[PDB]
Amino acid sequence: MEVEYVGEVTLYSFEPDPETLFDALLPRYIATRVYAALLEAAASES
Amino acid sequence: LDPNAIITAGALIGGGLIMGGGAIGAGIGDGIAGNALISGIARQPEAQGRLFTPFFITVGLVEAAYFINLAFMALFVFATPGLQ
Numbered sequence: 599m600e601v602e603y604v605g606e607v608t609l610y611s612f613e614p615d616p617e618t619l620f621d622a623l624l625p626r627y628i629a630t631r632v633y634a635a636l637l638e639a640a641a642s643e644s
Numbered sequence: 645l646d647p648n649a650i651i652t653a654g655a656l657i658g659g660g661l662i663m664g665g666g667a668i669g670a671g672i673g674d675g676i677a678g679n680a681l682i683s684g685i686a687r688q689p690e691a692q693g694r695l696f697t698p699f700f701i702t703v704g705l706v707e708a709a710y711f712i713n714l715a716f717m718a719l720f721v722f723a724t725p726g727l728q
Contacts, residue, residue: 608690
C-alpha cells in the first residue's frame, strides 16, 4: 500500500504502542478490503 | 568558650539542615507535579483549568511543608531554644 500524504486536516493516546497497533491492524484492513471486494463481486454477479 | 557559642553553632547547622531538606523536598515535588501538568497539557490542549486545580492542590501541599520547615528554621536561628 503506497502512502498517500496531505498537509493537515487533541492527539490520540495509543496503547501499548502505536507501532504494535499498526502492525496488528494492517492485516485487519487488508481483510476488510478483501471482504468489500467480495461483497461488490457478489452484487455485480447478481 | 561561651556556651551560647556552641548552642548557636548547633542551631545554625540545624537550620541549615532544615532548609536543605525543605528545598530538596520542595524542588523535587514541584518538579514532579509540574511534569504531570506539562504532560497532561501536552496531551490535551484544553485540560488547562481542570489540571491546574489538582496541580494547585499538589503545589500547596508541597509548599506547606517547605514553609513549615522555613518557619522552624527561623525559630531555630532567631529564637534558639535552649539558649541562655
